[PDB]
Structures are given as structure tokens and as C-alpha cells.
């Protein structure tokens, strides 16, 4: 089988920069008779299936911007993005089709660097229907921020910081390159009902005050 | 517009059987070779099988790892390609894509891919989700935008599909990756709408869990 | 055909407020007086209120038990009648019907009634149902007819609406009265179809629980 | 307020028989000037809303069969069904509209006697999804039988009769006058998984053998 290798495994670049990524095959992908390299490049944006970008090593598929250029021959290929855009955020895969079985490289994950952005924070008390099952999940959403490492702090009854929390980050956004993240504090209903104030705070190494959102059980 | 739509994934025990379907539209299905490609975190993208045209007696070729266990077949009258899998193993877990092979006879590149269908080979049991609406603490105390949420708890396996207003509400949505704990997944989805849409209009969270053949619709009420 | 469709019931705590709607079709709504009638096991049928025409300044009359708490109103442009209830009490629990008053000025008989909407005045909490598919032990060992079931468990309050194939499968259905235990209801629904429909076709149980604004669809799989 | 009384509270009759039911008011429903009695009769079939049958005491609403006849005057009214049909199964209510508030009688429930009919029995093992929650409801349906009092017996592991059962009967059917009934045996998953054979048996005081339906957990 032909082994395909790609490099680097991931790259992080800001909009407008040039990116170069390579793909090597264990034997030539050329057909000497027709002088074509039987190599394709696919782009897979977050949450989507792969899409054909380039085939025959340097022919672009319809719709693909000419910022993408495939080049190289034989065993060494290159995909260049002349000026990277936020929407190019994706994993890029090469694939040989010189011989069966058709095989793929492991991918180059392209990440986008951008300006810091503060989250939009929203806090939600446990669903009353969830309380009927005996569980209480307090949820906090921290949407459209950057960089990725943000600190979420839960406080129960005003500044008693708490920790049985589960956090989950989205992929980077294809349009604005931000991240979003859910922070969920799950307690029993009885523990939830022993306290009044529930607060979710977002910080990221700053002199800048946290974004704080709260609710009080005594609003009922 | 060319479209490929996969269906049929779910959870199967090791040794089990499962058949995937892929319906094509927007092109003369009969004139094109078709493939099945799969993707997993551990193996990346893998070509699984291909199938040619009626004049080639629908000739098929397979990856070695599935040969003798999987069958790719097509029905040109239904514009569909299928993948019948037997004797399934844990390493057959992944997202399966049907793909169209490029028209030119020697161009084997795969120019259109479906959205994929998920296959889980596991001995664990299927567990449908509980779905809870997440409204803000106050519907009368707002800002110019309001964010609503939906908590999809205690299911197995992945995935679940969350939509808002049956997919009509698509902008301002964030559906977070599920978190696995005590063998069950939990995920949340948020949607941010102008203050003028809620609570003045109905907003509904729609959850599908294909493996348990379950659909739950929950209105987000004040 | 004349049709009256009520909506808006659910569960409210004692002291709470709730507004019922009734949309009319198949007649000139503006030319008829409308009423609200309610029904409970303990009081039987009770006339609650009526409302006359635009040329009578929409004059209203009420039963003594609701006077000062309930308001009947209409919107002729929407062909609708409403019932706005305040300061609700346990004895206001029941099924509320909107009814059309006969056309002739002194015939007060109520010639068309809607399907009714359920009102529960209680301090208990709303609890959505769990829904389980009930397939026969064997899909290959059949008789000429097959019966399938759907178990709708652990909800409050009543009612729940069970349908099969979105109401397309209506003959051979038996939806049993719910049984109350430990403050929660459970009910089952059976559907009997020819052996040629299942498992060869998909059969789906559809459950709505209006009080929790929940809809669950479960395919009956082998 | 005018008080309306109806009699009898319920009646049971076989198809083709004549039924008579009465409605009394605490004061006259007549308007002497126009010689009309301001009295209506409504029919409410099982699972449906009331429908207007008769108004002005003896005028039928469009669509109502002439087997129904309203009669009487002043304070004493009668609804007669000349030859009862299975589809007449219903509660019949009278209502005065001589004066506000409009008031109703308590209803006469009409029940239908018919030939004995054996149930169609179907048994279902607990849903595997229900077992994920720790509960096991074994369900049995006994459909379209008569009379109403039928005996359902559960057996666990061949003839050990069991009892933590919940039974629920439908109303009589509007078309065939039968009843249907669900019998549900709920155990924990662990108790359910300690036994192999589950059987549901229907009998009704007979020399005739029970209808028996069963399943074995070892079919898996």
C-alpha cells in the first residue's frame, strides 16, 4: 500500500499570512505516460465532511479560490495558501489515487490566530423539570471569545468558589475564529436548594475585571 | 445542486450486522462510480470500497480490512448506494461517508461527499436522552439579545442532532461537544436571538438521537 | 365544515393565571355568539361564560363561580374566542370547551363544540414522560396481524396525546386510561396492523405532553 | 338558578331495544308567549365532546337520526331512543336555556349489552431502553372482549402466579361495544432478570381454557 505522510501536524497563522503544508508518498504518484500525478487535496472544515480542493496535484475543483495552489510531483507535494482567510480554518488531507487501495495522509490542521475577544456570558438556573429527576445542572455559556484558554469560575453563595464542573469548548468558528464554551455545574437538587446565589465568572489573565453573571433563587 | 444523503448508522454489538444507505440527487447517478469512505480519530480517513457502472457489471473493490465482511452495492433506479456490513468490530466504529467518484474514467478523486452517518460498534446499551429547556432566570429583565439553552442529558451513544425551530433558527447557535461521564453523554446547545423574538415568539429545541430512534421537541418557556 | 380548536391548557398553581384560545373555521365567526363550557367528574358540565356580537359591544355574561376572575373576549379578525382566567382554584380544574351559540337570536343552544383543552390547578410540579417502544419478542414469528405498543411513563399532569404514524395509523388503536401511582401517571397504547406492514414498514409512536411542552417520537423497532 | 335532574343515572341495553330517559327542571322551561320549551339534549360519546342532539325540546339538529325523539314540556322532559344502536353508546345530558345561568343535568350514561367475546391477547417483554433506567414493565394487552369483568393472571416461571400488576380498561367501543384492557407487571430489572418465563393469561368464569401468551428470556 502507498503510505502518505503530511507535515506539519498543525499550524497556527493569522489572517493574511502565507501557509505551506507538505504531503509525501512512499512511492511516486506519477504516471510517466500521461505526466499526471494521481494526487488529491481535501479540505474538511469543522463539523463538515471533507471537500475536494485539488486533483491531478494542481488542478483546482470548481469553486475553490485561487489562493489555494497545489504543487509538486512524484513523492513530494505541497499545498500553499497564499494569504490565509478565517474561513480556511480546516484540516487538510492529501490522498493518492495512483494505486488501490486509495490512501490518505493524516492531515494538517490549520488554526487561526486572531485578536483577543471577551466572551458573552449567560447563566441559567437548573431546569425545573430536571429538578423533578433529583439533579440540578446550573449552566453557563461563554460565547465567541479568544484566545481559547479562558478561566471559568463558579461561585455559590457569593464567593464560595465551587468545583464539580464540566467544561466543553467548541471548535474555532469558521467566520470569526472565536471559540465558545459551556460550563456546567451539576449538584443534587437538595444541595442546589441549600444556597441562594449562583454566579459564573469569566477571566483570562488580566487586570481587567471578570465578566460576571448571576442569579438568586429568592427571585421566586 | 449535487447532494448525497447517508442514513442507517446507529449502535451494533461486535459481530453484528448493519446496512448503510446513501441516496443521491442532482446528477445522473448511473453514470458515476461511488465509494464509501470512513473516518475515525485513531485511523483518520480510510477508503473502504468502490463500485462501478452497470456496463462493468457493477464491479467492486474493497480495502483489505473489510474484504469478505462488507458489501458495497447500488440501485440505479433509486439513485442509491449501500454498504452492508457483517461481523462488525470495534475498529469499524466511525463516521461513514458515501462519495461520488469523478466522472472521467481514470480520475478516481472523490468530488462530492455526503454528510456522513455514524457507526458505533459496542457492547454497551442504547440509552435515550432526557431533554431540558433552559430559559433565563427572568423573561422580563432583558438586554437587546437573549440567549436560550437546551440540555441533552444521559444518552449513549453519540451522536445527537440539536436544531432550533426545526432548523429555521440557524444563526447564533452553539452546540457544544458532549462530555462523557459514567458511560453516558451530556451536551448543551445555546441559541442567541434578538430580544424581540423571545419571549414574544415560541422558540423550540429539537433533539434527535438516531441510535434510539428518538426525537424530542421542547419549547423554551419563560 | 364547522371546526372549533381550543389550545392553552396546562398546569397552573392555585392563584395562577392562564389564557385559553379557540380558533374557529368553516363559518362567519363574527355572526355568532360564543361560549366557554367546562367539564369535570365532580361537577359535570358547567356553562362558564358567553360573548355576543360587535353590534352588542361584545356583551358578556358569566357563571357566578367565575365572575370577577375570568374574562371571555373575542377577536373577529382572527376568528377566535378566548378565556383569560385569574386567581385559579382547584375547583377550576377540568376540560374547557369553546362552543358556538346557535344563530337565531333567542336559541341559546350550543350547536358546535371544540375538542376541549385541559386545565389542571395544582401545586404539584410538571414532569415530562419517558416513552418506551414495545415490540413483540420476535419479529420473525408472527400471525396475520401484529400488535405493537408504546409505554408512556412517569408524567404529570394528564393528559398526554398518543398517535401512531402521526395520526395516519388510526384504526386498530387502543390508548388505555392512565394509572396514577406515587403522584405520577403511566399509560400504554397498542396498535394492531396486518403482518405485511411490520416489520416491513416503519411504525412510530408519537407522544405529546402539552403541560411540559414536550413531543417524543419513538420508532417501534424489532 | 334552575336545577336540572336526570334519571336514571345509567342504563344498560342490548341493540334494538327501546330506551327512555328523563330530565326534570326545578321550574318550567316554557315561554308561554311562543309555546317553546327552552331545553336541549346533548350526546357525548366516549372520548369526544358533547354534540347537540335536540333543541326547543323536540327539534332535532341536522344529522341526528330519527330514532332519537325529544318530548315533554314545562318541568318534565323525555329523550327516547326507539331502537338503540351500538353507536348510541354515550352519556346524554339535558340543558335548560330558559334563564341564565344556563344549567345542565348530571347525565344518563347509556351502556350497551352484547354477546360474549374473547380477547385478543398480546404480551411484550420490557423495553430494553426501560431496562437502562432500572425498571422492567412487562405489558399485556387484552383487546376487544366482553363482558367487562375478565380475569388477567400473570405467571412468572411457569405457573408461579404473580401480583404487582396495574390494570386499566378502556371505555366500551362505539362500534362493537367491546372493552380492551392493558395489564402491566412492573418489577425491578434485577428481579426481571432472575426469571425466564413470563406469561399473561385471560379467563372469564369458564370451562373454556384461558387464552395464554408467553415469552422466554432465553430466546436471546
CATH (domain of C193): 2.60.40.10
Q: Count residue pairs from A and C with Cβ separation < 8 A.
A: 10
| Residue C213: closest C-alpha in chain A | A129
How far is Cα A71 from Cα A56, in angstroms, rounded to an integer? 10
Task: Please tell me whether the peptide bond between B112 and the residue prior to it is cis, using omega within 30 degrees of 0.
Answer: no
- DSSP per-residue letters across D37-99: E-EEEEEE-TTS--EEEEETTTEEPTT--TTEEEEEETTEEEEEESS--GGG-EEEEEEE-SS
Going by C-alpha positions, the residue among C29, C99, C101, C111 that lies closest to residue D61 is C111
Residue C54: strand, helix, or coil:
helix
Candidates B212, B214, B216; nearest CB to C214: B216
D74 within 8 A of D57, measured Cβ to Cβ: no
Q: Residue with C-alpha cell 327552552?
A: D38
Do B52 and B94 have their domain in common? yes
**B128 touching D, CB under 8 A?**
yes
Annotation: CATH topology of D115-213: Immunoglobulin-like (2.60.40)
Please state, in angstroms and rounded to a whole number, the distance separating the CA atoms of residues A180 and A170.
Answer: 5
Quick check: C144 and C194 in contact, CB under 8 A? yes
Determine contact, residues C175/C169, Cβ cutoff 8 Å: no
Residue C190 forms contact with A (CB below 8 Å) = no
* Other beta carbons less than 10 A from residue D7's beta carbon: 13
Q: Which chains touch D (3 or more CB pairs under 8 A)?
A: B, C
DSSP labels, D121-172: EEEEPPPHHHHTTTEEEEEEEEEEEBSS--EEEEEESSS-EE--EEEEEPPP
> What CA–CA distance (Å, rounded) separates D115 from D136?
36
Which segments of chain B does DSSP mark as H helices, in order?
A: none
Residues C7 and C90 in one domain: yes
Q: How far, in Å, CA of B155 to CA of B180, rounded?
A: 9
Cβ contact, residue pair B126, D129, below 8 Å: yes
Tell me whether residue B50 is exposed, middle or buried, using C-beta atoms within 10 angstroms of its C-beta: 0 to 12, 13 to 18, 19 or more: buried
Provide the 10 A C-beta neighbour count for residue B189: 23
Determine the Cα–Cα distance for residues B57 and B54; give it in Å rounded to an integer.
Answer: 5
* Contacting residues of D for C190, CB less than 8 Å apart: 122, 141, 143, 180, 182
Are B83 and B68 in the same domain?
yes
Q: Please give the CATH number for the structural domain made up of D1-114.
A: 2.60.40.10
Please give the grid coordinates belonging to residue D86.
351500538
Radius of gyration of chain A from Cα atoms?
24
Instruction: Give the chain B residue whose CA is nearest to the CA of D129.
Output: B127
Q: Is residue B117 domain-shared with residue B168, that is, in the same domain?
A: no
Residue B68 CA to residue B91 CA, distance in Å, equals 16
Q: How many CB atoms lie within 10 A of CB D12?
A: 11
* CB-count exposure of residue C125 (10 Å: 0-12, 13-18, 19+): middle
Rounded Cα–Cα distance for residues D199 and D201 (Å): 7
Residues closing a segment before a gap in chain D (C–N exceeding 2.5 Å): none
Contact C215 B216 (CB under 8 A): yes
Which DSSP category does C109 fall into? Answer: -
**Do C180 and C129 lie in a common domain?**
yes
In degrees, to the nearest 5, what angle opens at C-alpha B75 toward C-alphas B74 and B78? 130
> What CA–CA distances, in Å, run from A198 to A157, A158, B137?
6, 7, 11
Q: What share of chain C is helix, strand, coil (3-state, %, to 5)?
A: 10, 50, 40
Name the DSSP letter for residue C104. S
Q: Is A139:A39 a contact under the CB 8 Å cutoff? A: no
Show the cell assigned to B26.
442532482
Q: Positive or negative CA dihedral for A30, A34, A35, A40?
A: negative
Experimental approach: X-ray
Cell of C142: 408472527
CB C211 within 8 A of CB C120: yes
Q: Give SS3 for B207.
A: strand
Same domain for C187 and C154?
Answer: yes
Q: Alpha carbon A113 to chain centroid distance?
A: 12
Cell of residue D107, nine digits:
347525565
- Determine the Cα–Cα distance for residues B134 and A128; give it in Å rounded to an integer: 9
Q: Please name the member of C212, C215, C221 whose beta carbon is closest to the beta carbon of B213.
A: C221
CA angle B182, B180, B175 (to 5 degrees): 145
Q: Please tell me whether residues C1 and C79 are part of one structural domain.
A: yes
A135/C contact by beta carbon, under 8 A? no
d(CA A179, CA A171): 6
Residues in chain A: 220
CA–CA separation, C184 and D82 (whole Å): 44
Q: Least CB-CB distance to C179: which of D143, D168, D215?
A: D168
Q: Both C63 and C173 in a single domain?
A: no
Rounded Cα–Cα distance for residues D92 and D50 (Å): 9
C142 and C45 together in one domain:
no
SS (H, E, C) chain A: CCCEEEECCEEEEECCCCEEEEEEECCCCEECCCCEECEEEEEECCCCCCEEEEECCCEECCCCCCCEEEEEECCEEEEEECCCCHHHCEEEEEEECCCCCCEECCCEEEEEECCCECCEEEEECCCHHHHCCCEEEEEEEEEEEECCCCEEEEEECCCCEECCEEEEECCCCCCCCCEEEEEEEEEEHHHHCCCCEEEEEEECCCCCCCEEEEEEHHHC
**Do A and D share at least 3 CB pairs under 8 Å?**
no
- Tell me if B37 sits within 8 A of A44, measured CB to CB: no
Which of C108, C123, C138 represents a domain boundary (last residue)?
C123
C159 min Cα distance to partner chain A (Å): 17
Cα–Cα distances (Å) from A128 to B29, B222, C214, in that order, read 51, 11, 14
User: Where is the domain boundary, C123, C148, C175?
Assistant: C123
Three-class SS state of B155: strand
Chain C residues whose CB is inside 8 A of the A129 CB are 126-128, 212
* Separation between Cα atoms, residue D14 and residue D177, nearest integer Å: 10
CA distance D149 to D188: 29
Identify the helix (H) or strand (E) that includes residue B162: strand B161-164
Answer whether A41's CB lies under 8 Å from A70's CB.
Answer: yes
Same domain, C14 and C113: yes
Rounded to a whole number of angstroms, the distance between the first and last alpha carbons of chain D is 67
Number of domains in chain B: 2
> Of B100, B123, B146, which residue constitutes the final position of a domain?
B123
C-alpha cell at A14: 493569522
Contacts with C161 (C-beta within 8 Å, 6 or more apart), sequence order: C207, C208, C210
Helix, strand, or coil here: C78?
helix
Judge whether C99 and C35 are in contact, CB under 8 Å. Answer: yes
Distance CA A163, CA A152 (A): 10
What gap in Å lies between CA A218 and CA A212, rounded to an integer? 19
Closest of A140, A160, A164 to residue A214, by C-alpha: A140
Are the Cβ atoms of C130 and D49 closer than 8 angstroms?
Answer: no
CA distance B25 to B80: 9
Cα–Cα distance for residue pair D140/D182, rounded to 1 Å? 6
What is chain D's alpha carbon radius of gyration, rounded to the nearest angstrom?
24
* Residues with Cβ within 8 Å of residue D141, at least 6 apart in sequence: C147, C149, C174, C188, C190, D120, D121, D122, D180, D181, D182, D183
Q: What 3-state DSSP class applies to B193?
A: strand
Cα separation, C88 vs C17, in Å, equals 6
Interstrand relation of A90-96 and A103-104 (parallel, antiparallel or unpaired)? antiparallel
Distance CA A94, CA A67 (A): 17
Q: Which domain holds residue C166?
A: 124-222
Pick from D165, D167, D147, D145: which is nearest to D155 by CA? Answer: D165
d(CA B33, CA C112): 62
Q: Is the dihedral of CA B9, B11, B15, B17 positive or negative?
A: negative
- Report residue A123 CA to chain centroid gap: 23
CATH topology of D1-114 equal to that of D115-213? yes
Place of cell 490518505: A104
Strand-strand pairing, A211-216 and A161-162:
unpaired
Among D207, D212, D126, residue whose Cα is nearest residue D161: D212
From the list B175, B209, B215, the residue with the least C-alpha distance to B191 is: B175
Distance of alpha carbon C216 from alpha carbon B215, whole angstroms:
5
Between CA A213 and CA D186 the distance in angstroms is 45
Extents of the domains making up chain D = 1-114, 115-213
Provide the shortest C-alpha distance from residue D96 to chain B (in Å): 41
CA angle B59, B61, B63 (to 5 degrees): 165
Q: Which residues contact C134 (CB under 8 A, 6 or more apart)?
A: C148, C149, C150, C151, C188, C220, D124, D127, D139
What is the residue whose three cell numbers read 365567526? C29
Between CA B44 and CA B155 the distance in angstroms is 25
Amino acid at each position: 500500500d502507498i503510505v502518505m505522510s503530511q507535515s506539519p501536524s498543525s499550524l497556527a497563522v493569522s489572517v493574511g499570512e502565507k501557509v505551506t503544508m507538505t504531503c509525501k508518498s512512499s512511492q511516486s504518484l506519477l504516471y510517466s505516460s500521461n505526466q499526471m500525478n494521481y494526487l488529491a487535496w481535501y479540505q474538511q472544515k469543522p463539523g463538515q465532511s471533507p471537500k475536494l480542493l485539488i486533483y491531478w496535484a494542481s488542478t483546482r475543483e470548481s469553486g475553490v479560490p485561487d489562493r489555494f495552489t497545489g504543487s509538486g510531483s512524484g513523492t513530494d507535494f505541497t499545498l500553499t495558501i497564499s494569504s490565509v482567510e478565517a474561513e480556511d480554518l480546516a484540516v487538510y488531507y492529501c490522498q493518492q489515487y495512483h494505486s488501490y487501495p486509495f490512501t490518505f495522509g493524516s492531515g494538517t490542521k490549520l488554526e487561526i490566530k486572531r485578536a483577543d475577544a471577551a466572551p458573552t456570558v449567560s447563566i441559567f438556573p437548573p431546569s425545573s423539570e430536571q429538578l423533578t429527576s433529583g439533579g440540578a445542572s446550573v449552566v453557563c455559556f461563554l460565547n465567541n471569545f479568544y484566545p481559547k484558554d479562558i478561566n471559568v469560575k463558579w461561585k455559590i453563595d457569593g464567593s464560595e468558589r465551587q468545583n464539580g464542573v464540566l467544561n466543553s469548548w467548541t471548535d474555532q468558528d469558521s467566520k470569526d475564529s472565536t471559540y465558545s464554551m459551556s460550563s456546567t455545574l451539576t449538584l443534587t437538587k437538595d444541595e442546589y436548594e441549600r444556597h441562594n446565589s449562583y454566579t459564573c465568572e469569566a477571566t483570562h489573565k488580566t487586570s481587567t475585571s471578570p465578566i460576571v453573571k448571576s442569579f438568586n433563587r429568592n427571585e421566586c | 445542486e449535487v447532494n448525497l444523503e447517508e442514513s442507517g448508522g446507529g449502535l451494533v454489538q461486535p459481530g453484528g450486522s448493519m446496512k448503510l444507505s446513501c441516496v443521491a440527487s442532482g446528477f445522473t447517478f448511473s453514470n458515476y462510480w461511488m465509494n464509501w469512505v470512513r473516518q475515525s480519530p485513531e485511523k483518520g480517513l480510510e477508503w473502504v470500497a468502490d463500485i462501478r457502472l452497470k456496463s462493468n457489471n457493477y464491479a467492486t473493490l474493497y480495502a483489505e480490512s473489510v474484504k469478505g465482511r462488507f458489501t458495497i452495492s447500488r440501485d440505479d433506479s433509486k439513485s442509491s448506494v449501500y454498504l452492508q456490513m457483517n461481523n462488525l468490530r470495534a475498529e469499524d466504529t466511525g463516521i461513514y461517508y458515501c462519495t461520488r467518484g469523478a466522472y472521467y474514467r481514470y480520475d478516481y478523486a472523490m468530488d462530492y461527499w455526503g454528510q456522513g452517518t455514524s457507526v458505533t460498534v459496542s457492547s454497551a446499551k442504547t440509552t435515550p436522552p432526557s431533554v431540558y429547556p433552559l430559559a433565563p432566570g427572568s423573561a422580563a429583565q432583558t438586554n437587546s439579545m437573549v440567549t436560550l439553552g437546551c440540555l441533552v442529558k444521559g444518552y449513549f451513544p453519540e451522536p445527537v442532532t440539536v436544531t432550533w425551530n426545526s432548523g429555521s433558527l440557524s444563526s447564533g447557535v452553539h452546540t457544544f461537544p458532549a462530555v462523557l461521564q459514567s458511560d453516558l453523554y451530556t451536551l448543551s446547545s445555546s441559541v442567541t436571538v434578538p430580544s424581540s423574538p423571545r419571549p414574544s415568539e415560541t422558540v423550540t429545541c429539537n433533539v434527535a438521537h438516531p441510535a434510539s430512534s428518538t426525537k424530542v421537541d421542547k419549547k423554551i418557556v419563560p
